[PDB]
């Protein structure tokens, strides 16, 4: 199935408290494998999955050298954006950045992404065609024009179509046992009664990977998105995920209702 | 593998 590599960067200005906070994190699919945090003792890029530890000194010196450059560049960006929006030095402000590549089942380039947010809202993004920019506002146009003049998109496209694909492939092969696994969900159900008239039932999906899943409810086949309670998928802490869905309907008659789990690791859509 | 070039906003 499809795979992805993404880097996530957060830069937070600390007005009157010195250098801004910089956090960088890198994922292959749903597994984080590297981190850099300006607040931590090491000031290196650090492993967060077993299969990246085998990379040698040149890789770590190099990823450290680059993460500090991303840091330096985002520090300048926070000053630039304050200037663009004529914001005072009294407020804390956040620049966020994500980039990376998807590949398909053949491990060939599927899509690339490269986008910025300022204070929670979109600022500028590389379009799907990897040759043009969506600029959200008049300040983001100033960046768009700088980057068109300097042909930033073509350089970005080379990274995302070549280098990125290339190194994702390397990771997927080194983390073969971890990354290319599929954990089917351990299903079960629980039954409680809030009252005599209406009782509550809870469909449970545990210990699954990848994080993608769907829990729907059926009353002889329909979809009951009324009186429905779906929690966001959540990490268990051991690399797997959880999710549950529950609906309340009249007690004693609950087999007209049935819960359908659909996930990649489950060969046919298990029904309960 | 981080992108080795960076671009100022």
């Amino acid at each position: 199935g499809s795979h992805s590599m993404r880097y996530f960067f957060t830069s937070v200005s600390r007005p009157g408290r010195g250098e801004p906070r910089f956090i960088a994190v890198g994922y292959v699919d749903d597994t984080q494998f590297v981190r850099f945090d300006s607040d931590a003792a090491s000031q290196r890029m650090e492993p967060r999955a077993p299969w990246i530890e085998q990379e040698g000194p040149e890789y770590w010196d190099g990823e450290t050298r680059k993460v500090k450059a991303h840091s330096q560049t985002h520090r300048v960006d926070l000053g630039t954006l304050r200037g663009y929006y004529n914001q005072s030095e009294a407020g804390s402000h956040t620049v966020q950045r994500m980039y990376g590549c998807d590949v398909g089942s053949d491990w060939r380039f599927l899509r690339g992404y490269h986008q910025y947010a300022y204070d929670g809202k979109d600022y500028i993004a590389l379009k799907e065609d990897l040759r043009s920019w969506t600029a959200a506002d008049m300040a983001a146009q100033t960046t768009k024009h700088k980057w068109e003049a300097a042909h930033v998109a073509e350089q970005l496209r080379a990274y995302l179509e070549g280098t990125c694909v290339e190194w994702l492939r390397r990771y997927l092969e080194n983390g073969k046992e971890t990354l290319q696994r599929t954990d089917a969900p351990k299903t079960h159900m629980t039954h409680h009664a809030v009252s005599d008239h209406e009782a509550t039932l809870r469909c449970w999906a545990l210990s699954f990977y990848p994080a993608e899943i769907t829990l729907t409810w059926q009353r002889d086949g329909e979809d009951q998105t009324q009186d429905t309670e779906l929690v966001e998928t959540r990490p268990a802490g051991d690399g797997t995920f959880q999710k549950w869905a529950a609906v309340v309907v009249p007690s004693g008659q609950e087999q007209r209702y049935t819960c359908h789990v659909q996930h990649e690791g489950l060969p046919k859509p298990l029904t309960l | 593998y981080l992108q080795p070039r960076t671009f100022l906003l």
Partner: T-cell receptor
Amino acid sequence: TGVSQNPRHKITKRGQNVTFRCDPISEHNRLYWYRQTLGQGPEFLTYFQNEAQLEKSRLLSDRFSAERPKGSFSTLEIQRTEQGDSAMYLCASSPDIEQYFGPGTRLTVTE
Amino acid sequence: KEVEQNSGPLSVPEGAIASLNCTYSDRGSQSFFWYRQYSGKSPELIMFIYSNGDKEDGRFTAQLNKASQYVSLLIRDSQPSDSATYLCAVNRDDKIIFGKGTRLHILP
């Protein structure tokens, strides 16, 4: 219009100190110093982003020190010059990666 | 060397095709330039190329091959003003690393 450098030529007695100056293109946040000797390419010396010195060639001596105090002009200084310092000293600036060079300072160090 | 250029002064007759090539050490490079430097002057950019394939511009053709880490420049119909040192330039992070240069002599 362009990167400017002064002096264009400079003779210095071995042992003395010399200072070159570089006025870059005002919108260019990135500024670079190179050294070039006849028959060879420009060798990278140091790199500034705004006023911060980000990189330094690992071979560069502590007799060489560069500064860009307000993120505009830049100076490069050599202390206790020896004969092997004679070279073309090139300034360059860039908005991103493409480099635009000044006309250089050609330094001669003689006894 | 991080950037390697074809050795030896190249001598090519007025009106012929001159041809320069270059390899670079680090596969993660993204920015690639050809600079021209007259004998007593500073490097001046003549073109950049960022994607695989050919870039044509007047009498100049650049080629880039990322898989093999190879940069080329072809000058057709060489003028005497093409006599210069040709510098291959490749990014290492956000700085440009230059090769030693290839001298081109256009013969009358």
